[PDB]
């Protein structure tokens, strides 16, 4: 007699996609959940962005050459590169890492003069050839290398105190200058011993420059240790010293918050994103992706696939 | 499969229905032809693209580098974070496996549903016209030209109209 | 949905039952009335009751403080505890959206299927007596009182007792 | 007569309420409930606590003996409760690993106090004190802490040793101060011009200091700090003190006894709720297994989640009429 | 149950049912007897199978220890090494309750369904010579011998051979 | 009227599982998802191991007597034991958790001399009865003891380099002694006060030799404190001092990868493992363990469950 069928679609080739009891099945269609695509390029429309280029952050702080148009500034993305400078005199900060840190959560950097003056017998003016600008023997633009104004004098005893007058803490940096040879530490400071105190009501420290032999670095077998504290509002710092103390000219102040990016791929201000790792940025709507674990921002959940389909039909029964 | 039908009591799908997921082919005194069911269709695809809807929702976390890529990290707070980080993509990884079976399970069989509520939708239209023959088709006991045909799938089908005529059919008295 | 009853060939609901989850209503020469169904009703209210003392089996891991709420922490280890925090948090999260949804999903799939299983039950008991309407209603092909609704309500009712009667209506070969 | 009908239905109400799935963000169902708990008690829950409230005195207080915490010297708690601003210090200063300290203090059930049985020769004077530390109106000083200075002023502070050994079972916390002078005449006055060293051993521990002669603001009208330090002595150890001048040594050391729960708030303590979850803001009472309040909480607590809401179904599909 | 046979319509299993998981009992003039169904048996099976298969995949992931079981760990770092790891041994305790019971929800209920596939399945090959009980059986109105019998468990039951004795009988009307 | 009935299976006696409704389920069969059972043996085959026995990973690198035979070597897992052995003569080392974490992710050691010298008024054969060796005084063997070779005269202002010409990095460790009074110190060392500077182009650091009285340790009042860091490859790393270094007379380099297992469990060399703990190893299938959250390798997730049975069959419905 006369019929009628029910049915369903089918497609000559599916797509394989798991399930609960099955690693193979076959379905009409099926749309990836995990990406495998980024961006190489840092996608910065929309944000008010500062590429540091050749510029560590810390260098900031302390004013390396390749940092002199990066002093201060305002920003809600702040974006690091690879072998980027700190340092022009070798040396090291302490706790180097969490500083880093907290410039690369900032919205932006303030910088606030010490006042710090000095007396006849001291020079202020130290500078160096690891530290040039504009063709000359230079040092970092917020600390001053003191040193005996009469080549092998006894460094005067000194006191030198910065008020926070500011109702936002201050972050300052000074440096402890740790000479070659004896010679050149007595040349510099004179032949007394040395010692650097520094105390505000929440900090006390006390470091002592050191001769030690070696190797050169920036021709320089000198080195100058860094160190940094946080001044509250209303609260005074004081450096007691002797020789061997970087004093700070100008302290720093963190200012809101910002995103801070490792990557050294190029700059394009036409793509938007959330979301940035060392090689660009994602700018995808699925859940996951297998890109990289250190991703910044808000982002897709690393999973460790090529890929995960999600089914978006019925089970494949092909004629 | 759950339901029975898809890749069940119907031997296989059409390839060359391309106009919908669901649907009818039919013979008569006339000949044969198909079309497409909307109202199933688009119940599959509703739930299918809803699916995909609550899967775009985004976590609005915003997260800070605590590993830096150009400059080295203590050893044992190196070590801490590794063990942290790939316990969590651990996490992630188990529960994205989780979320696409489970998902696809429910999809497949949600799909094989459709597929029978449609079927179910026929057969009590036709009520005592017509009787199932085990792959999908039901043998109609009167003749059904095609717009009779096409009243089923529209589902203006009046059974009384041609319950007499099938019945005797459907007995041979 | 699944099941194909609920929001399904059944047009709607009955806001007027409210001694029950289901249930019938039934015409006959006496009138119309309406009665609900404990065994399917206890079926999905245990289900759900079941779930929800499932979802208050809470842990018994005791967690201590690893940030000072009045003193500073110092900011990497700080910052590696945000990262922590914010990550645990955010799988917690997308936990909840999931346990919710997918029990959401099972428990209105659930009830819809307890619905057609009733319906099924009363399909098969009926037998040859009746037919159905395709909206969920059986057209009872004999007289059936309201003891004899009450025995298809109780289970108890016997098809054989009323078979010869509803098959002359159902073939129209009533004698004149 | 034509057939009589019997028709099969389910409940539906007037209002049903809105609920998520897999596939609907706006699924109309009978009933529901929430899953992530919104609502905490902004009290301190403490029935069945044997508890200790610090008030003012910070944890670390406890330890060396500061006025504020005289009466939390010993004790024994299975809940420790500190509140802001409390105070650890009266002569200014800091101690190192201080929050790894804190820790500790706020993970145990008690404290005991232990002599260490330091004597000292007539060229001491064990018995310094100080404005900065206040007590029945006089100078005073840390209580499980002794101020050593030379008797005589000016006079160089003799060559020192003592050695606590831990004749317990357990291990002991062991507490000390390094006084890091104001000026050259001061240092000169309290220990003499000798070159100032003070070194630290045990069988597991190693330490030596310096105290530093250095210009700073005045903090309780001090400008000189005294610095704190910490180690854990073994049972059947020896830790002794060779010293000349700036150690502020233990008259008594610690034992932390047992487990106890650690919470940070200001919220007043209730005696008459009872909870096993506490934040900030005081206790979280639920039988939901999510909460919106906080993501930092101690205890056993429903885990965090940022949804203000997530609704349970505990009905079918609402198909009103 | 979901599907509303297995501990629904079916009032009990068969527990001299040992040769499968799925089957027949008859009655017929010949006596009674019993045979396992293969194919929904190992519908059934497979998908466990598949299942547990699935659930063997394991993690490629080393992990190094960051606890020293033999010395000493600073108390902070202890304390925040504690704090995470018993955060994500909450997480995949809470997985493993998750995963085992939406899986035995699973099972169970596809268990179910292929019971029912295999009453539908019968159901649709009697056609109009049977009628049901409501209980799982299917009262067959004409002589169903043996091999009948056969022919309905292998599913090469041909109904329009005894449409017309079973018509006739199931319209007798009986006291 | 003949007859066919539909039907299951049942059991006598099921087992009881858990369902998002039901807590008492009961289920044809089922099989457990956590394992209970681990090997109390660590499952060496197929692995090219070293087994420490009483010697800590530590001990490698300076060379204590208990480690002799663990001075260089290749492996793929190694093996720490409880109470073994890293110093002979008393001591402590800066980060050293740190630095079994690195030696205990390591896939080997090897050793390269620096080649340092000593003029003729520095004995550098300084010997201990705290470090026995063939029934003689000996010393660490990577190490060397130097003193001044007159008893009370000054120890010489002494300057060594090593210079790493490798192409990958080297692990340098030294040694500060703390004598434990004046009279020992003079004898040692002489009467000028002691400074030990240690400087590379990535380092820079300075110790102070301090006398102190404190409780014998395997006879020694004595003290010797360890140092480390790394030396990049090129790089020159100097040491100036008069008095108190021990000097390293070999440095280590760190090869490949390994796994680290801390566990007193005897070794089998016939069964396989990926994952191991305090107590041995865990083989199994299943995806989660309650044995223990400490493990190491490729391992089942720890939940805090005895059991989690999974269905395996219909639900049971006897007669
Ligand atoms: C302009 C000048 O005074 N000297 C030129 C040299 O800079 C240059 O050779 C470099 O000299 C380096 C050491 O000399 C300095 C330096 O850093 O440049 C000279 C600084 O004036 C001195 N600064 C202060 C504040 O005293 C500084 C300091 O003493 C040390 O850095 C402390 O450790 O040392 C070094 O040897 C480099 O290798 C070299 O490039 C020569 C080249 O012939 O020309 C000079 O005119
Ligand atoms: C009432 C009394 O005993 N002394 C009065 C002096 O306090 C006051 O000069 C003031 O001295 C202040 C610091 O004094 C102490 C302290 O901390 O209170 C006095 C302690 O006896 C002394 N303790 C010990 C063990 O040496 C202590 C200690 O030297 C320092 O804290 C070390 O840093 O100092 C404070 O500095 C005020 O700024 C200062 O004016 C004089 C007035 O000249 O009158 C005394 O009666
Ligand atoms: C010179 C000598 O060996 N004299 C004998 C003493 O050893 C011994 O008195 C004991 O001295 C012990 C320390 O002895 C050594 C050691 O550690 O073995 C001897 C080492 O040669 C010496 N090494 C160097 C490089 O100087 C070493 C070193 O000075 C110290 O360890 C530095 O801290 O000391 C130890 O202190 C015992 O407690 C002490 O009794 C007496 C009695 O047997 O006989 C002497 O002939
Ligand atoms: C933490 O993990 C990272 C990533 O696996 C390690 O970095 C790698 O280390 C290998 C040496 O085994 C280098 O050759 C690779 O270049 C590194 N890869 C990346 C992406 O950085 C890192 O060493 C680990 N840290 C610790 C302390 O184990
Ligand atoms: C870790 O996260 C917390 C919460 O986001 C941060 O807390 C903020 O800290 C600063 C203090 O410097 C305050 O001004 C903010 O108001 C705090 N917010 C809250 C909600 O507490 C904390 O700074 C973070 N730590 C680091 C190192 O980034
Ligand atoms: C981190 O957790 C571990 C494991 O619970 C703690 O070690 C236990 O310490 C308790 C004392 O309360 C002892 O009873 C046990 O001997 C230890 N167990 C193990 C397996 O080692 C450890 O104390 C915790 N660390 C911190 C800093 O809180
Ligand atoms: C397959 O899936 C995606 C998402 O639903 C869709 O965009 C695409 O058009 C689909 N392909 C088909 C129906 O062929
Ligand atoms: C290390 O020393 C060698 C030989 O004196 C020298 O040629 C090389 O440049 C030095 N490396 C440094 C200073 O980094
Ligand atoms: C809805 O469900 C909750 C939890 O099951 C219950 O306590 C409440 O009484 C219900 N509300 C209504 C209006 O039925
Ligand atoms: C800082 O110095 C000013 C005077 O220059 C003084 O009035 C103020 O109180 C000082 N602050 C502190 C904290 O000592
Ligand atoms: C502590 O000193 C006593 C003094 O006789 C000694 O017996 C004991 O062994 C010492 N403890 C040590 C070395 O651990
Ligand atoms: C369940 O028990 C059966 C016995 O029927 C046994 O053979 C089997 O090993 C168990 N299940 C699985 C999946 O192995
Ligand atoms: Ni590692
Ligand atoms: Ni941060
Ligand atoms: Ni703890």
Not at chain 1, 86 to 110: D, F, H, W
Not at chain 2, 121 to 138: I, M, P, S, T
Not at chain 2, 151 to 162: A, L
């Amino acid at each position: 007699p006369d019929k009628i069928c029910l049915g369903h679609h089918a497609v000559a080739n599916g797509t394989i996609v798991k399930t609960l009891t099955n690693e193979q099945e076959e379905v009409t269609n099926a749309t990836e959940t995990v990406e495998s695509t980024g961006i190489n390029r840092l996608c910065m429309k929309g944000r008010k962005h500062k590429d540091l280029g050749n510029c560590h952050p810390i260098g900031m702080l302390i004013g390396t050459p390749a940092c002199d148009l990066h002093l201060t500034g305002m920003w809600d993305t702040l974006i690091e590169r690879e072998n980027a400078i700190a340092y022009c005199y070798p040396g090291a900060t302490v706790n180097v890492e969490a500083l880093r840190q907290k410039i690369m959560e900032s919205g932006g950097i303030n910088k606030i003069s010490t006042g710090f003056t000095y007396g006849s017998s001291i020079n202020s003016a130290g500078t160096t050839r690891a530290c040039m600008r504009n063709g000359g023997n230079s040092f970092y633009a917020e600390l001053k290398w003191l040193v005996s104004k009469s080549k092998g004098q006894n460094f005067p005893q000194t006191t030198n105190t910065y008020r926070n007058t500011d109702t936002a803490e201050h972050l300052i940096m000074w440096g402890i200058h740790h000479p070659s040879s004896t010679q050149e530490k007595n040349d510099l400071y004179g032949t007394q011993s040395l010692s650097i105190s520094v105390g505000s009501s929440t900090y006390r420290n006390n470091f002592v420059p050191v001769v030690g032999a070696r190797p050169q670095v920036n021709g320089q077998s000198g080195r100058i240790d860094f160190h940094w504290t946080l001044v509250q509002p209303g609260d005074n710092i004081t450096f007691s010293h002797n020789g061997g103390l970087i004093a700070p000219s100008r302290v720093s102040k963190l200012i809101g918050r910002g995103l801070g990016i490792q990557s050294d791929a190029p700059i394009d201000n036409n793509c938007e994103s959330k979301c940035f790792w060392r090689g660009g940025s994602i700018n995808t709507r699925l859940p996951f992706q297998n890109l990289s674990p250190r991703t910044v921002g808000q982002c897709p959940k690393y999973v460790n696939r090529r890929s995960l389909m999600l089914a978006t039909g019925m089970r494949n029964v092909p004629e | 499969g759950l339901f029975g039908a898809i890749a069940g009591f119907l031997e296989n799908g059409w390839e060359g229905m391309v106009d919908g997921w669901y649907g009818f082919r039919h013979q008569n005194a006339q000949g044969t032809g198909q079309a497409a069911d909307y109202k199933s269709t688009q119940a599959a695809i509703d739930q299918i693209t809803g699916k995909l809807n609550r899967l775009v929702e985004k976590t609005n976390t915003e997260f800070e580098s605590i590993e830096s890529e150009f400059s080295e990290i203590e050893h044992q707070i190196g070590n801490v974070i590794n063990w942290t980080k790939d316990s969590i993509t651990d996490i992630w990884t188990y529960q994205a496996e989780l979320l696409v079976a489970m998902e696809n399970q429910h999809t497949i069989d949600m799909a094989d549903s459709e597929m029978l509520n449609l079927y179910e939708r026929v057969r009590k239209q036709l009520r005592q016209n017509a009787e199932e023959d085990g792959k999908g088709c039901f043998e109609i006991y009167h003749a059904c030209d095609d717009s009779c045909m096409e009243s089923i799938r529209n589902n203006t089908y009046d059974h009384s109209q041609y319950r007499e005529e099938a019945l005797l059919n459907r007995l041979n008295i």
